[PDB]
Amino acid sequence: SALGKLQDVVNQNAQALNTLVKQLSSNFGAISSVLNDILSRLDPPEAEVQIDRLITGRLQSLQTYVTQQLIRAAEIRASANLAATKMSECVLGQSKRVDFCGKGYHLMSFPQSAPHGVVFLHVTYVPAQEKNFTTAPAICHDGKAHFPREGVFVSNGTHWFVTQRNFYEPQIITTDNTFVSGNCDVVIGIVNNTVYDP
């Protein structure tokens, strides 16, 4: 059931073909549905009208079939454009669009050939085993604000550490990964701490 869309497309095409073939069984008001039988049983005067009615019916059926086929072809063109976009943006690179190639942080993709389709193997990065911590916007050591360049100030209960956003990796809060901007009475949520200077 993985290739459900491909199976549905194949089934729709098969049903359309079968209906187009079966539409030759109706007379559309004529005496019979067999053109050869009509031509062999009727005179040209009435045969002209019978052929006209059969032609009208079959032409209407074929026009309906062609319209449905054009609609399905437009849908398949849209799907193929989406597939080519996903290929160019995930197989030939690393997409940053959310929920575009796999549910999670996109890493890479592998294309796989399929009958009248394509299968992508989206490799994602899903975080797990999350732990609760106490966070703070900034800290003040010597009367000046201290904001982390890249990271979040977390505390395990007694000591504050700066770690990554998608992976817990605590580090000592130093002046290398922390800059100064402003004072300690303009930020709401300041926490008195000590910044280490190497």
Asked whether 116 and 10 are in contact (CB, 8 A), the reply is yes
143 binds its own copies (CB under 8 A): no
154 binds another protein (CB under 8 A): yes
Q: What is the CA radius of gyration of the chain?
A: 35
Q: What is the DSSP string of 49-114?
A: HHHHHHHHHHHHHHHHHHHHHHHHHHHHHHHHHHHHHHIIIIISS---STTSSSSSEEEEEEEEEE
Q: Which residues bind ligand NAG (CB under 6 A)?
A: 128-132, 156-159, 170, 188-189, 191-192
- Residues closing a segment before a gap in the chain (C–N exceeding 2.5 Å): none
Residue indicated by tokens 């089934």? 11
The site map against its own copies for 150-189 (x = CB under 8 A) is --x------------x---x-----------xx---xxxx
CB of 126 to its own copies, least distance (A): 4
Separation of alpha carbons 166 and 92, rounded Å? 25
CB of 197 to its own copies, least distance (A): 12
Binding residues for its own copies (CB under 8 A)? 19, 22-23, 25-29, 52, 57, 61, 63-64, 67-68, 70-71, 74-75, 78, 88-90, 92-93, 95-100, 103-105, 124-128, 130, 132, 135, 137-138, 145, 147, 152, 165, 169, 181-182, 186-189
